[PDB]
Design a protein around this ligand. Structure first.
Ligand SMILES: CO[C@H]1O[C@H](CO)[C@H](O)[C@H](O[C@@H]2O[C@H](CO)[C@H](O)[C@H](O)[C@H]2O)[C@H]1NC(C)=O
Ligand SMILES: CO[C@H]1O[C@H](CO)[C@H](O)[C@H](O[C@@H]2O[C@H](CO)[C@H](O)[C@H](O)[C@H]2O)[C@H]1NC(C)=O
Ligand SMILES: CO[C@H]1O[C@H](CO)[C@H](O)[C@H](O[C@@H]2O[C@H](CO)[C@H](O)[C@H](O)[C@H]2O)[C@H]1NC(C)=O
Ligand SMILES: CO[C@H]1O[C@H](CO)[C@H](O)[C@H](O[C@@H]2O[C@H](CO)[C@H](O)[C@H](O)[C@H]2O)[C@H]1NC(C)=O
Ligand code: CA
Ligand code: CA
Ligand code: CA
Ligand code: CA
Ligand code: MN
Ligand code: MN
Ligand code: MN
Ligand code: MN
Lengths: 232, 232, 232, 232
């Protein structure tokens, strides 16, 4: 069994174990701030440096994984609280899309909302061009910010949010459990064939974006992960 | 939203939030020990005292839940390490089955292996009469110890095991993530309609058992839980 | 440490975590309405269904607690706005006193105003038989509605009141902070030895009452609570 | 009556409503970071710019108040997690003590551990020179970091902590409730005569400090406050 596991209680910009893309910055409190509040169409992303093998071309096996993280989004004067954070998986050579307009692309897709990735978004603005639901929501994305599925949710400014994600390889099911401020949990699950959508090796990470008038603080506070690929 | 959430970092006899059934005991370290090492066919179960309303007949809605717990099973001389621990959900009036022979019934079913419950078992003995796989395993049970589905696992004597479970009501998916000794994760997921299998009010808990020759230490170390039912 | 904590942002009939006694009802908006506007001597009480161990005869330790709740009292035609709401603590077998005349008893005491409970009352009618102050007030009650202590307070019809209560077991101090409509705060604190006045296990809740001519809307809107008993 | 109330969901160093002293800084995420991790004997404090009238030399009346706040302390490599945060009340002309050695002085007292202030300290290091308890603790201080009283507590790195404080002028009682990561609540209360210890007009705020080998992240995330003084 090939296992990749790690844990971040805090981040240090000088740690090579993580790739910093775009406007991402690391605060003195150890938090990763994904976007630059003072830039138009800002986009920042963070990736665990080591690529993870999610499936074997020899056995045909797909890995299962369990990951938990905590983020925080907070409103800022005088901008519309947008656009949200997305936890994504993508080719190891993934980079912020060329000429990215940020905003509703969440830093992972082109203007049409397409890209090569699988993710769980925590969307705080309704983009009609991507068929977003009317309210804040958590969504399961497969190569598009036009979610395969979404569930109503509520982004509380200044609130620390906990998320737990389980990917069961046999059923190809991706399950998400979000722990809100008011105490309630929000869940969403969807069958996504990682082996059919992503290459053998991939990088896991977070991305957030903003536009001209849409901006807010996007912070990653902690992140634990364990993936196990059966090789027997 | 109707939410039920608790977090037991340890336990204590006298705590009104816990119903003890059978040979259950509380160790001075706070751990719960489910079976009596000196009793033939021992059965011990622990339940969260408060009944949980998992679905509403008035709205047809079903709750989602996130729960995680840690346990430990340890060998003893000279008995065969059996039988295992099961995290179950059952009618609020659930009691240890009458005339229970313990053993492979895990304290939740009758001799034939049938009962009224939904659970996640951590089986350490292969009972052919219940069609168990040949080795240790984690299984998803629905009214029977003859698992609807199982996955190879390994119970390490004295190893602390961590488990995270997510039930997404919308998809009716019950997914389990088990973090073992060597740090590898083992997962199993199964679509289970709690609404169709259980009554509106149920109780959550743990059960363990042994036989004349099959005995071992079964400990529950911690348990956190959050369930949310959309009331509207 | 043995801890009981919960957070109700709203309520719903059927939640097994709440015990309804008397004329209480749940409104479509999630608010709990304690009294029946059409019944004489109406009494409604709501209790957290799980008993709380506030102290242990074995260790002698006493729990500390923090709780916040919000309520609203609203006038109606053509009845006299009475009688008020009381947040109370009583033995777990507590029931509305047999033959309750409601009114100034607040649903927790007998006609003489005596009972077995500890509570914080928000009194909107001056009962000379219980030595009430001449104006609305907040009072600390120990086995009697003839408050051990009171402080002037005004109940504004239709106003949302927010309350915060801290019980420090070491000093045995029960401290109350009441946040009015105008923004002013009103506080009252009293040393109350719960270990000497109540049994080890008790229930927390709210009660309200009315008489033939005294009636008003008594609503409980939210309630968060956390108690912790040291078991070491 | 004379009331003062405010609420901070986030802070900005470019806001008049607040005084900054020492090495204090405001992070892009709105959080106030009291100490500088790169300085020896670092000391930082923040104060509500508007002095609050807590008692009257004309009437002898003393104000009551309710205030709550959330903070966060976090370890760093490779220093000792020290020294802590203290919520304090002091004369309006209060400033960081001249030649402050920071450290166990929490930035409010002299080397001997004396000063003019009343406060609630959240201590993460045991200074024997100030008779500190052997573990982390919450303390009530009256002109000295040699606490009038303390209670065992546990500072969890990276955890957001919520505090509620009530001062009841009639009983001169200062009660505190602190919400831990494991869910438990800790409380401590103490009779403190503010009229005798402090001037009519005072300033409320926060202070934190570090030493050569003792440093950690000290954050003040939010702060609500309401005080009411009767003028009649
Ligand atoms: C004319 O539209 C551009 O400028 C406005 C502000 O004047 C917005 O920034 C708009 O972007 C959209 O903004 C929201 C929030 O207000 C959110 O960030 C959306 O994702 C984003 O598309 C911007 N247009 C574009 C296409 O960038
Ligand atoms: C003749 O079989 C009974 O007695 C033997 C020991 O002499 C076992 O205790 C056996 O029970 C089975 O024991 C294993 C462990 O080796 C495990 O506990 C199985 O679940 C259990 O059935 C017992 N027979 C029965 C059916 O109770
Ligand atoms: C003769 O007194 C009885 O009937 C009157 C109305 O006709 C009142 O209901 C009175 O009760 C007292 O009413 C006030 C409100 O005006 C408040 O509810 C008091 O607590 C209550 O005693 C009632 N007498 C009694 C003792 O029930
Ligand atoms: C010789 O002692 C001085 O230098 C050491 C370096 O290891 C410490 O910084 C020490 O200060 C004390 O440090 C702890 C943490 O390790 C905590 O911050 C105490 O409050 C502080 O006294 C320092 N001495 C002094 C008096 O500054
Ligand atoms: Ca969007
Ligand atoms: Ca078995
Ligand atoms: Ca009265
Ligand atoms: Ca100290
Ligand atoms: Mn979306
Ligand atoms: Mn089995
Ligand atoms: Mn009264
Ligand atoms: Mn101290």
């Amino acid at each position: 069994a090939e296992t990749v596991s790690f844990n971040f209680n805090s981040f240090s910009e000088g740690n090579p174990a993580i790739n910093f893309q775009g406007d991402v910055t690391v605060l003195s409190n150890g938090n990763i701030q994904l976007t630059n509040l003072n830039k138009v169409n800002s986009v920042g992303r963070v990736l665990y440096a080591m690529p993870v093998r999610i499936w074997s071309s020899a056995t045909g096996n797909v890995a299962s994984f369990l990951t938990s993280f905590s983020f925080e989004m907070k409103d800022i004067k005088d901008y519309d609280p947008a656009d949200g954070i997305i936890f994504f998986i993508a080719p190891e050579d993934t980079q912020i899309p060329a000429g990215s307009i940020g905003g509703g692309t969440l830093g992972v897709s082109d203007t049409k909302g397409a890209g090569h990735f699988v993710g769980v978004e925590f969307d705080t603005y309704s983009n009609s061009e991507y068929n977003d639901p009317p309210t804040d929501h958590v969504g399961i994305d497969v190569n598009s910010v036009d979610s395969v599925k979404t569930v109503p949710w509520n982004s509380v400014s200044g609130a620390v949010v906990k998320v737990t994600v389980i990917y069961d390889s046999s059923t190809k099911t991706l399950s998400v459990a979000v722990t809100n401020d008011n105490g309630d949990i929000t869940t969403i699950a969807q069958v996504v064939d990682l082996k059919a959508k992503l290459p053998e090796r991939v990088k896991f990470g977070f991305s957030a974006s903003g536009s001209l008038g849409g901006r807010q603080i996007h912070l990653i506070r902690s992140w634990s992960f364990t993936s196990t690929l059966i090789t027997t």
